[PDB]
Amino acid sequence: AEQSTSAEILETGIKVVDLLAPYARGGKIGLFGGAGVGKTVFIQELINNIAKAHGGFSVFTGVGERTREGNDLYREMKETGVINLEGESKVALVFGQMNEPPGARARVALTGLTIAEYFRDEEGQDVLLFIDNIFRFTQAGSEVSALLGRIPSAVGYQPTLATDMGLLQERITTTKKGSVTSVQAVYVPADDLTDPAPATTFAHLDATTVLSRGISELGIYPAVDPLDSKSRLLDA
Amino acid sequence: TPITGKVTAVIGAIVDVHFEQSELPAILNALEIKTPQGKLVLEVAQHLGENTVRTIAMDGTEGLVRGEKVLDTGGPISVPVGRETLGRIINVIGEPIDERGPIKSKLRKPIHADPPSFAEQSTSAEILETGIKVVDLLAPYARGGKIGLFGGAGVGKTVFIQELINNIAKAHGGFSVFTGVGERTREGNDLYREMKETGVINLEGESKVALVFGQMNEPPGARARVALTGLTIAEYFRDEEGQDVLLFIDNIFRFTQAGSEVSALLGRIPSAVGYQPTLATDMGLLQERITTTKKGSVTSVQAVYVPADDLTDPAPATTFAHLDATTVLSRGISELGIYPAVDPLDSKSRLLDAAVVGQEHYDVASKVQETLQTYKSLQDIIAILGMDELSEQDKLTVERARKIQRFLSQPFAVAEVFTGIPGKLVRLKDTVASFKAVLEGKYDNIPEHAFYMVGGIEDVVAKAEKLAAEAN
Amino acid sequence: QGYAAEISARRNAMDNASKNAGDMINRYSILYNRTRQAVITNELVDIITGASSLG
Amino acid sequence: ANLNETGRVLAVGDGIARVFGLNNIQAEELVEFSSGVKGMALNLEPGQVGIVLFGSDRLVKEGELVKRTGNIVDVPVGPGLLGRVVDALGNPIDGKGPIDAAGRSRAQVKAPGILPRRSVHEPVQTGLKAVDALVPIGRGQRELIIGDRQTGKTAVALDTILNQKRWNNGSDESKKLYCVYVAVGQKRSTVAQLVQTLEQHDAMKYSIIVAATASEAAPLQYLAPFTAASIGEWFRDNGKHALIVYDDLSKQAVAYRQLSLLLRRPPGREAYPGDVFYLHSRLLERAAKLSEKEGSGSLTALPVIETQGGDVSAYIPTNVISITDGQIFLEAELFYKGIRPAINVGLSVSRVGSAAQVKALKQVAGSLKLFLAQYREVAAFAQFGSDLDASTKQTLVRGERLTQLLKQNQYSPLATEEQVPLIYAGVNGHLDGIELSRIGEFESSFLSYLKSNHNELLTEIREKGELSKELLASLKSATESFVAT
Amino acid sequence: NLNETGRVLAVGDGIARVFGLNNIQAEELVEFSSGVKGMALNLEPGQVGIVLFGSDRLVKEGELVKRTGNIVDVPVGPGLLGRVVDALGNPIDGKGPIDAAGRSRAQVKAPGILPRRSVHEPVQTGLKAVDALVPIGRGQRELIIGDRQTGKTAVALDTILNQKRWNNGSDESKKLYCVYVAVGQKRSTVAQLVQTLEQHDAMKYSIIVAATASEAAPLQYLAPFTAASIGEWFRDNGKHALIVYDDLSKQAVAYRQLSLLLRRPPGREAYPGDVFYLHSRLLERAAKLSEKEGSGSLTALPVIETQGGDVSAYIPTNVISITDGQIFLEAELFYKGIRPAINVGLSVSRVGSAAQVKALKQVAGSLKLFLAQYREVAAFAQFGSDLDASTKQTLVRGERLTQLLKQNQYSPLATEEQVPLIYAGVNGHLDGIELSRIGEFESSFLSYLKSNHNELLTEIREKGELSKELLASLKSATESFVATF
Amino acid sequence: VYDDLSKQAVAYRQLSLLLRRPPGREAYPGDVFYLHSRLLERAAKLSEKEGSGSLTALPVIETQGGDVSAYIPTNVISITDGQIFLEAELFYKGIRPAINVGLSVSRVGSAAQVKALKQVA
Numbered sequence A: 001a002e003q004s005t006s007a008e009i010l011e012t013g014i015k016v017v018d019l020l021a022p023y024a025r026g027g028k029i030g031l032f033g034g035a036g037v038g039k040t041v042f043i044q045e046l047i048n049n050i051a052k053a054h055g056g057f058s059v060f061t062g063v064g065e066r067t068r069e070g071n072d073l074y075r076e077m078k079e080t081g082v083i084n085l086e087g088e089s090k091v092a093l094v095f096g097q098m099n100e101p102p103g104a105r106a107r108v109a110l111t112g113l114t115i116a117e118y119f120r121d122e123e124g125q126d127v128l129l130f131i132d133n134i135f136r137f138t139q140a141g142s143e144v145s146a147l148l149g150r151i152p153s154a155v156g157y158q159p160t161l162a163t164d165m166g167l168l169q170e171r172i173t174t175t176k177k178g179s180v181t182s183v184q185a186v187y188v189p190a191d192d193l194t195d196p197a198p199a200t201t202f203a204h205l206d207a208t209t210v211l212s213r214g215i216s217e218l219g220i221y222p223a224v225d226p227l228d229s230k231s232r233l234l235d236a
Numbered sequence B: 001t002p003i004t005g006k007v008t009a010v011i012g013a014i015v016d017v018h019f020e021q022s023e024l025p026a027i028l029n030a031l032e033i034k035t036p037q038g039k040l041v042l043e044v045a046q047h048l049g050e051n052t053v054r055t056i057a058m059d060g061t062e063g064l065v066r067g068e069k070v071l072d073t074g075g076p077i078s079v080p081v082g083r084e085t086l087g088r089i090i091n092v093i094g095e096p097i098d099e100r101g102p103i104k105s106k107l108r109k110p111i112h113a114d115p116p117s118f119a120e121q122s123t124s125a126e127i128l129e130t131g132i133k134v135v136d137l138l139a140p141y142a143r144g145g146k147i148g149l150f151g152g153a154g155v156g157k158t159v160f161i162q163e164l165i166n167n168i169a170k171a172h173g174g175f176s177v178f179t180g181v182g183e184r185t186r187e188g189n190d191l192y193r194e195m196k197e198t199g200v201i202n203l204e205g206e207s208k209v210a211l212v213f214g215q216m217n218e219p220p221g222a223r224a225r226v227a228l229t230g231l232t233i234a235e236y237f238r239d240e241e242g243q244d245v246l247l248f249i250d251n252i253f254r255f256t257q258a259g260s261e262v263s264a265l266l267g268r269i270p271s272a273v274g275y276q277p278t279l280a281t282d283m284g285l286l287q288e289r290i291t292t293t294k295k296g297s298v299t300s301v302q303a304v305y306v307p308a309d310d311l312t313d314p315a316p317a318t319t320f321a322h323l324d325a326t327t328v329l330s331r332g333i334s335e336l337g338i339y340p341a342v343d344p345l346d347s348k349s350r351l352l353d354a355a356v357v358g359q360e361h362y363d364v365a366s367k368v369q370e371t372l373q374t375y376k377s378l379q380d381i382i383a384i385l386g387m388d389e390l391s392e393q394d395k396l397t398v399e400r401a402r403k404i405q406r407f408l409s410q411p412f413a414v415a416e417v418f419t420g421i422p423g424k425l426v427r428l429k430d431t432v433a434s435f436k437a438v439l440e441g442k443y444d445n446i447p448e449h450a451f452y453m454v455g456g457i458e459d460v461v462a463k464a465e466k467l468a469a470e471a472n
Numbered sequence C: 001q002g003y004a005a006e007i008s009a010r011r012n013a014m015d016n017a018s019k020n021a022g023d024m025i026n027r028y029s030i031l032y033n034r035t036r037q038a039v040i041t042n043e044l045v046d047i048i049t050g051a052s053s054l055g
Numbered sequence D: 001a002n003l004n005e006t007g008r009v010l011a012v013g014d015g016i017a018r019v020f021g022l023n024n025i026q027a028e029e030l031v032e033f034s035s036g037v038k039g040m041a042l043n044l045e046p047g048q049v050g051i052v053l054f055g056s057d058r059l060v061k062e063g064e065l066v067k068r069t070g071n072i073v074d075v076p077v078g079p080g081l082l083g084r085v086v087d088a089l090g091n092p093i094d095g096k097g098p099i100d101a102a103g104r105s106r107a108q109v110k111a112p113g114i115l116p117r118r119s120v121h122e123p124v125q126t127g128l129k130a131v132d133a134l135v136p137i138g139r140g141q142r143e144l145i146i147g148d149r150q151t152g153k154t155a156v157a158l159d160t161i162l163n164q165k166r167w168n169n170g171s172d173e174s175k176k177l178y179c180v181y182v183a184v185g186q187k188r189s190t191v192a193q194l195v196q197t198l199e200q201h202d203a204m205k206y207s208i209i210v211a212a213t214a215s216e217a218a219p220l221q222y223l224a225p226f227t228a229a230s231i232g233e234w235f236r237d238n239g240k241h242a243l244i245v246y247d248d249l250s251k252q253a254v255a256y257r258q259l260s261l262l263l264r265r266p267p268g269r270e271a272y273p274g275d276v277f278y279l280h281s282r283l284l285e286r287a288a289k290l291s292e293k294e295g296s297g298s299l300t301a302l303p304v305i306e307t308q309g310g311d312v313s314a315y316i317p318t319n320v321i322s323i324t325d326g327q328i329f330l331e332a333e334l335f336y337k338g339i340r341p342a343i344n345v346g347l348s349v350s351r352v353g354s355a356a357q358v359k360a361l362k363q364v365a366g367s368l369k370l371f372l373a374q375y376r377e378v379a380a381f382a383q384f385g386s387d388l389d390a391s392t393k394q395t396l397v398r399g400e401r402l403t404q405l406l407k408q409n410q411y412s413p414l415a416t417e418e419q420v421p422l423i424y425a426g427v428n429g430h431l432d433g434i435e436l437s438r439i440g441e442f443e444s445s446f447l448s449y450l451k452s453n454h455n456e457l458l459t460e461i462r463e464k465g466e467l468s469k470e471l472l473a474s475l476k477s478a479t480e481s482f483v484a485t
Numbered sequence E: 001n002l003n004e005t006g007r008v009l010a011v012g013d014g015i016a017r018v019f020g021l022n023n024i025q026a027e028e029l030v031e032f033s034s035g036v037k038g039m040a041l042n043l044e045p046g047q048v049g050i051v052l053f054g055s056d057r058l059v060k061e062g063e064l065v066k067r068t069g070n071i072v073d074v075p076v077g078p079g080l081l082g083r084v085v086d087a088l089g090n091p092i093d094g095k096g097p098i099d100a101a102g103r104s105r106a107q108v109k110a111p112g113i114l115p116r117r118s119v120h121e122p123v124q125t126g127l128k129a130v131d132a133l134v135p136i137g138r139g140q141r142e143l144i145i146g147d148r149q150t151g152k153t154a155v156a157l158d159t160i161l162n163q164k165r166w167n168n169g170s171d172e173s174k175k176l177y178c179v180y181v182a183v184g185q186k187r188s189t190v191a192q193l194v195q196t197l198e199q200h201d202a203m204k205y206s207i208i209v210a211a212t213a214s215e216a217a218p219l220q221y222l223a224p225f226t227a228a229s230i231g232e233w234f235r236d237n238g239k240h241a242l243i244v245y246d247d248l249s250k251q252a253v254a255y256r257q258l259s260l261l262l263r264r265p266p267g268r269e270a271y272p273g274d275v276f277y278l279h280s281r282l283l284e285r286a287a288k289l290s291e292k293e294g295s296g297s298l299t300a301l302p303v304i305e306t307q308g309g310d311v312s313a314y315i316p317t318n319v320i321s322i323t324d325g326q327i328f329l330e331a332e333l334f335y336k337g338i339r340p341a342i343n344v345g346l347s348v349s350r351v352g353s354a355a356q357v358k359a360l361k362q363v364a365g366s367l368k369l370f371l372a373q374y375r376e377v378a379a380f381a382q383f384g385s386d387l388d389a390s391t392k393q394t395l396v397r398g399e400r401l402t403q404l405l406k407q408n409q410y411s412p413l414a415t416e417e418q419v420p421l422i423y424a425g426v427n428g429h430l431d432g433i434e435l436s437r438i439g440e441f442e443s444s445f446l447s448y449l450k451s452n453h454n455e456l457l458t459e460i461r462e463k464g465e466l467s468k469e470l471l472a473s474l475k476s477a478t479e480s481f482v483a484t485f
Numbered sequence F: 001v002y003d004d005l006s007k008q009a010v011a012y013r014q015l016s017l018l019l020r021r022p023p024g025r026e027a028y029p030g031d032v033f034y035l036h037s038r039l040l041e042r043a044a045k046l047s048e049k050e051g052s053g054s055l056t057a058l059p060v061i062e063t064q065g066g067d068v069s070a071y072i073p074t075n076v077i078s079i080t081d082g083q084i085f086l087e088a089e090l091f092y093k094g095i096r097p098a099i100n101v102g103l104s105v106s107r108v109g110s111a112a113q114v115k116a117l118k119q120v121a
């Protein structure tokens, strides 16, 4: 009953976005492409824009984040201005190192989700939740369910996989008070989309912003690929 | 004094019964439980020990309460046998389910019985004309032999049988036994309509076939025994009556499928693929009973299901060895629009011998295979390069081959509601001459379309002429 | 003149060949997945069946 | 401490609970815990009992109190469910007040026997031309909707519901066809927006919604199809016609394989348990056409299965195909070429269509299915560029025209009377001469020609529903005259 | 008390946990009160695991059990000749009791390293494709691996039929007795097989052991071992034997069943760990004995059933490693018209020419190597490019040699009839003949020699070799016939 | 330089199985990834305040026929910061060391390369 009865577009601040693959308000967006395409640069952007257009804060969540990258990220964010120590920050950071046990890894996401829901139900803002990467979240579960003794499903993943995915994606939605838009990266295991983990993830994704090397190679910034970027809200 | 016991456990289609008395019922025996809805029949499977036994439910176990009283029958599940079963629909348990009163039969034999002795085995090499081109030409069925119809889902296994019943059961003269194992309940009803309309089964009059059903809607225990029920009835007319009988089973796979559901609860260690360790035996005892003996002959048309279109699957792979004729349907052929989707290559029989079907028949058939084979071996080339790269000799064989393949199709009277084309029954004699004429290259002028869904060879030239007027 | 006509046809021949053969790769590559996953799940079943052994 | 109707929790985890007691409990009987969570005695052992959890195990603590319901899991059934959205238990989730149920039915019902049945013969207009021509659906049929992600699987089921409005608003009852949509493993928004579209088209009045979101525990998604089934079975026994659509059964099996693996059950193909077949089996069987003695009621089912990479050879898919009475595969390739609905005539099938199809369509569309089947074989064989003869080329020109004619936009249902004319022209060849890019505009312009002129023909095919030997001629002279201009 | 007796604790699936029996040996035969016998495989303090040879519906808890005191053995000797027995060695043909001379155990130690001889004695299989390419030798085990419905049994069957040439003779050291071991087959087939042997007066020197599918798993498992002891008999008394297993693939499935049911942990695909040791200690039992031992010998023709042509499988690889080569049979070659469909590319014989006949050894030296070149040229001419004189010359001959190897079933050809044909092939006298002519050419050429040049056939037969003179006459006899017609 | 992590996992798998711990993909317990991740993350570049000290890691993984999709390799490749993929084929041609430029990558790149060489690389 608290769910909305209509999907609306969420103005980001990028032509390549609003015109081609627009972000769904309270939907799930898939971000492809690793370092080299300025992934980090494309993230801090969405945090600024929305902070000025919708004035909604952002929450970054790192599951099995590389301690190396976590450092350079934090530092970069202070150089861009998305995070000011003396002034006012706009985004909260919640990293989950890789050297941590599966237990913690599989909960990092929920930790960041909680903080985000606060500004949705309390302050009613269009908060953005960033998850990198939704893949290690499934892997985390797989190691946990593995140790517990639970029998391995198809491909080795956990049987409970189906329910877990929903205990995170469903919580990210637009309510009557506020809304939470998820911008989580996606990793394709062995360049195969038949695999359960990806298959299950895409079932919630509403849009996908791909970042190709060949796009940034032509001097096009951001490296967003117009052909690959698609949205489920691209209708009259 | 009736032997009585109490339930100790109820897990799915598996109920554990315990007896206070020191006398325990043997294995394969029946049991009954009083319920408001009726009576629930059980079947002993194994003695767990401690005066406790493990049994398999024959119906839903909903409502069963632990410690409830259980009455013993004193004998393995038996079912009425005799001419009294004809024109009646019998249940897995052996009771009328057509609402027409109890089957007043003379004798009632058990579903469990040992396979015929090796000395009792009788072999025969008599051909059986069906009217089906792709069969009577490539893998002809034998009288009182074993027939198998493999194929994935929606390939044409039943529709194939229905035609066999529309062409053999009518001009047969003996008795018939149809048993639907784990199949659409709807197909059973429509099957009942057909038997009545055709007059095979006349309520007021007599009938020529008995109907035994253990549909998929029924729990695993039933889907496992139904096959045995139907078989007991047919082995009666075989020994007792000593008359030709046609045993139609569909689908036989459900037999092992239903047994692999419970094997887990029975406490058996799952073999590869999940199938119960004793797949070979169980399937063995069944097929060994379905055969012709020195007392009577029985022609069985068993349909086999192919999981995920995989013929290497242990279920179907252990079925071929129990068949004198194998007709496999590939969904890769049905999708082409070719029906029946019989695969000439994979299809085998024991009658495909010149010392039986004749020297000429042997040669014509072989030529058809080679031609079809050569088309398949170049299929990779065709998708990549094309026919332009094919040699003169090879390019001529392809076209000819493609002509032979399309010609294999045949309109089915039963499937007229699908093709919109009236059935076509072709004799073995004409079929041979037909292909032989195509091999000689006497119809290389006629377009391929004229071979598609065509009955008699005459109809080819007829259809070719009709296409001349349609060209604008 | 008839040489310029061969090269022209041969340039068309190998164009469609790359398209068919190319597109054929995008078909077998899918069969390589289902077959890869099958081997990973099957090898896993024996490992579980060998450990689920009790009395 | 009555160890006859109540017991204590011994252990909990993996979504299963082992309670001690309950000596008078029935197999698969609903139960409740101190927290208020409903369970079900899926198995009974000496000295303990297995209960599945319909809620989060967080709420189940070890050593709590466990009371029994005394009745097997059931759901409210009646006409009062119309326009109302409930869950797997039958409780309202929309907030329009409690449900007005006429009675309560078991969650696990057995399919009607073989005797109390009749072959389907009642056409069920889906609004789609390519559908009600190649693989029509009848009252009591079980048509599968198989296809890959985003291929238009629900788009065929959804339009069917909106097209029923043409008879639901009528006075007669045997013409009306109630609808019961089932959503399992789907998103909250996905269902909410789905409901909204129904209200815009005013189709929710005659439709019942059952929810089993992914967030909800697996078992809910497991029992959702069965319960939702009983909701529509009611209409059947009352002599009414109902239509239930599962979206989707493939996810269910995944949810069930969960409880299946948790309870330690030997894995099968693709990690699915051997009894996965009996799952969808027991569910679909409960959809057929009863005899006249029963009430002449029916229950049409439209199960949905999602495949991977266009693989109909998969396990789950084949298991369903060996139960349903025909499939409507939706290839992705055709979906991207614009060809929508992306119905692949090659794999599409109808085991009881002509039997439940309008005779007006049976006449005009003869051997159209087989032709198309052979069409793709010669079409994909001439796409190399090679030159062909007149025979293959002639069939290649007519095939293309028919393929484009099968195309249809969503939310645009057409009356059978409107479909009959289009098919006639395709087979005859009048379209062949017509340009390929004018096939679309031609359809919209041809319909207006009949309404403005030969309206009498439309009114005849409407009532009669069959083309006589006389109307056949009046039609030919009317189309031929239009093709020329 | 319980030392020689015991009470049954549980029973089911052909397994029976009896309590007691604290003086029973390993793998010892036992008898229940019901009459049914059993075999003890698992020895434990609590209970003893026993496998049933018959149905288990007769054994019940608390039943008495008695022991035999002896290891499961079978009757052996010449008496069995022409009789059809079961695992245990009891008659199943109904022709009186088995008059055996001695009784030997099922499990027998393989012959020693010292008492052996290198294989030098040929095994005329009557199959040209075989005796020319992959010759069989008295004392080796030549595998016959292939998919279903290819011609595995055929190869074996024809062999037995060919032995009639010497078994009707007076000389013993030349004859060769045959032991067919049906395992997993249906009684229907076995009956037809034995019928065919009689139709060729081949049953008199043939022993058959039946272990049909219907029988208990322990029978199918023990069948081969007992059957081997039967044949070993001749080997020890200085006679030659030829056993055919058909097929070990089923036997492993059977032996897999006892393991799983006895609750013995599975290895790969549920097969028992020592599944290799199942075929290893079987095939090694057949070999050529020393002159001191009797110059006796036992040849083995194991049969395996692959799936989808996958020789990389678990069981097949296990056996390929043990057997002295294999006669690979491909389904695809069968349709192409290569019958028997022996793939030379993959079929080899480890004994090689040592076993082959000396005469036939000369006429075909690099023939196998040449057929390798043929497939090399046949694949390269696929390009559609013109071929020079060399690549076409070998292509012409290589194509006809493949056509000469084709031989009809049930038609074994003597050595004196194989040499001449191969001679005219390897040389190049068939090059100048049409392909569809090679067929009748064979029969015509033979009839030519049997009428005119019959003296030569008589020299090749006795001598078994080719002298400088015999080649001269044979040379002229060939050319003279080519000129004819 | 860890030469090689592949062998380490095998050893650890052995202990885990013998101890009757749950077997995962390819018979590797769920904590196998936690093993290498808790090893490689130990090497890094300490800041100026910490001592500016540094620990470089060059882990070695042996694939089975180029199968980088295997379990163990996927774990390692996911944690490291670049690969020096080597192919036997390239080795045979003569290209030694056979470092597949196409696959070999480094996420740090020029950040840690001499400008004298960066200007020509």
Ligand SMILES: Nc1ncnc2c1ncn2[C@@H]1O[C@H](COP(=O)(O)OP(=O)(O)OP(=O)(O)O)[C@@H](O)[C@H]1O
Pocket: A235, D147, D148, D149, D150, D151, D152, D153, D154, D155, D340, D341, D408, D409, D410
């Ligand atoms: N005939 C059509 N013409 C144009 N667009 C269509 C047509 N049918 C469906 N679509 C579009 O395809 C989109 C995907 O929705 P749809 O429900 O059809 O996919 P689906 O395969 O049913 O997805 P799911 O199975 O997950 O529900 C729809 O939003 C709709 O706009």
Ligand SMILES: Nc1ncnc2c1ncn2[C@@H]1O[C@H](COP(=O)(O)OP(=O)(O)OP(=O)(O)O)[C@@H](O)[C@H]1O
Pocket: B321, B349, B350, B351, B352, B353, E147, E148, E149, E150, E151, E152, E153, E154, E155, E339, E340, E407, E408, E409
């Ligand atoms: N040399 C041959 N020429 C022609 N046909 C043959 C030949 N050998 C066998 N066949 C045919 O092949 C069919 C099966 O042959 P065969 O019995 O040898 O196969 P198999 O390997 O025994 O298969 P299975 O193990 O299932 O019996 C028979 O119908 C037979 O007619």
Ligand SMILES: Nc1ncnc2c1ncn2[C@@H]1O[C@H](COP(=O)(O)OP(=O)(O)O)[C@@H](O)[C@H]1O
Pocket: B151, B152, B153, B154, B155, B156, B157, B158, B159, B160, B339, B340, B410, B411, B412, B415, B418, B419, D322, D349, D350, D351
């Ligand atoms: N001889 C045939 N000609 C045309 N179609 C056929 C034929 N046999 C079967 N079919 C197709 O199979 C469908 C029915 O499937 P069915 O034969 O019942 O499959 P199954 O073997 O799974 O029962 C029909 O729609 C029909 O088109």
Ligand SMILES: [Mg+2]
Pocket: B157, B158, B183, B250, B251
């Ligand atoms: Mg069927």
Ligand SMILES: [Mg+2]
Pocket: D152, D153, D154, D155, D247, D304
């Ligand atoms: Mg859908």
Ligand SMILES: [Mg+2]
Pocket: E152, E153, E246
């Ligand atoms: Mg055989």
